[PDB]
């Protein structure tokens, strides 16, 4: 008796320029009381379509919806980088209102090699007893990348974590930080700190390093 909305696919990658389709099938006849939402990274879900095929003001005409009863489709034509987002279908025919599991639209783009920057721990942090070294990999594609930490030539392990940006809305690249965390005392015992990064865009690993002081 509860309207489950099954969305497909989970992930979808497309190129700028292409036509993409997102499917949504309701477990029970829902008429045409279906709507679609778009949620860009960091933002609330924004409403694109209502009544299956009607677009809300300020919504590009390259977004169209169709279907009826149990089968529904969201077509995005001339896909643009700004379109990178998570899409949700919804049924508001019967209570409770239900949403689909969502579809993540990712954009394919050409290989881009990362810019690498390293940052020593600030003096203020060192006075606090801990030391964070940060390695930034900027504006690269694709998402996969290997960051290796070396301290006085000794390969590190188990003492760093990575964070990755969501694809950029304008250029579709990723950014990545790798943070090496040592104790004030261990940082002070070593001199050469380096992060080595390997990536599809580099024909050979790139190393960034600095000397303590």
């Amino acid at each position: 008796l509860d309207n489950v909305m099954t969305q497909s696919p989970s992930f979808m990658s497309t190129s700028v320029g292409d036509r993409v389709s997102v499917t949504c099938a309701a477990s029970q006849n829902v008429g045409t009381n279906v709507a679609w939402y778009q949620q860009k990274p960091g933002q609330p879900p924004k409403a694109l379509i209502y009544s299956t095929s009607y677009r809300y003001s300020g919504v590009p005409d390259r977004f169209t919806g169709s279907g009826s009863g149990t089968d529904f489709t969201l077509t995005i034509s001339n896909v643009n980088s700004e379109d990178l987002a998570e899409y949700f279908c919804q049924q508001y025919n019967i209570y409770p209102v239900t949403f689909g599991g969502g579809t993540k639209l990712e954009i394919k783009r050409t290989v881009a090699a990362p810019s690498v920057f390293i940052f020593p721990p600030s003096a203020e942090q060192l006075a606090s007893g801990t030391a964070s070294v940060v390695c930034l990999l900027n504006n690269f594609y694709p998402r996969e990348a290997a960051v290796q930490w070396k301290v006085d030539n000794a390969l590190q392990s188990g003492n760093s974590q990575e964070s990755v940006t969501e694809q950029d809305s304008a250029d579709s690249t990723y950014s990545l930080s790798s943070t090496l965390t040592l104790s004030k005392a261990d940082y002070e015992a070593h001199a050469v700190y380096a992060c080595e990064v390997t990536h599809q865009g580099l024909s050979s690993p790139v190393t960034k390093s600095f000397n303590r002081g």
Partner: protein
């Protein structure tokens, strides 16, 4: 603006009132509803009310859990969440809609159910230097370390600087505390003209820091 109340850290068993106000227009002239989003993915409709023409409804799932009210006097909607558990940790969205028009949502309210006490972040500069500059481009940032819970907002120069800024998703450390960095790319020739300040806000702890990040010196 569906202005929603700030992030909330609530202990298990306790409750919270999340508010929502339409700045400029009376929120109670339309139908207001709330949705729950878990782990930044799945969306659940909780319920709604329309003060003027009825048709208020609840999701059987949140019947006991949630109570929706409205305050016409100050054009503000509310959701009351009682007997909270870890499963209630989520982002709660307030939304208003009229027939075939605006389907407008609020910025959302992050609720974290924890027996842990808040911890405001430390903010250290990620100083630009010859090793943080590629050609004519330089990178600098702020490390926002050891805080709980989420979220935390970061802006640059009070919001006037947005191009080139990357604010990383928070990541959990083995201490159980969150940490993240915010970096920006700028012309290396500008490094000595306009100052660069990162504005860090952590509402649950009441932490407001304005760290200036300058080139390294000795």
């Amino acid at each position: 603006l569906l202005a929603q109340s700030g992030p909330e850290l609530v202990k298990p068993g306790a409750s919270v009132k999340i508010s929502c106000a339409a700045s400029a227009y009376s929120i109670t002239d339309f139908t207001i509803y709330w949705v729950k989003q878990s782990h930044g993915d799945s969306l659940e409709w909780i319920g709604g009310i329309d003060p003027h023409n009825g048709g208020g409804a609840y999701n059987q799932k949140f019947r006991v859990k949630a109570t929706l009210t409205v305050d016409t006097s100050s054009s503000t909607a509310y959701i009351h969440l009682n007997s909270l558990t870890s499963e209630d940790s989520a982002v709660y969205y307030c939304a208003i809609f009229y027939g075939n028009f605006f389907d407008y949502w609020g910025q959302g309210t992050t609720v974290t159910v924890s027996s842990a006490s808040t911890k405001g972040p430390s903010v250290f500069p990620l100083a630009p230097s010859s090793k943080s500059t590629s050609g004519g481009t330089a990178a600098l940032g702020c490390l926002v370390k050891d805080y709980f819970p989420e979220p935390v907002t970061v802006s640059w120069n009070s919001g006037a600087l947005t191009s080139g800024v990357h604010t990383f998703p928070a990541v959990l450390q083995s201490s159980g505390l969150y940490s993240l960095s915010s970096v920006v790319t700028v012309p290396s020739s500008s490094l000595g003209t306009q100052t660069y300040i990162c504005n860090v806000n952590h509402k649950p702890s009441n932490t407001a820091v304005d760290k200036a990040v300058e080139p390294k010196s000795c």
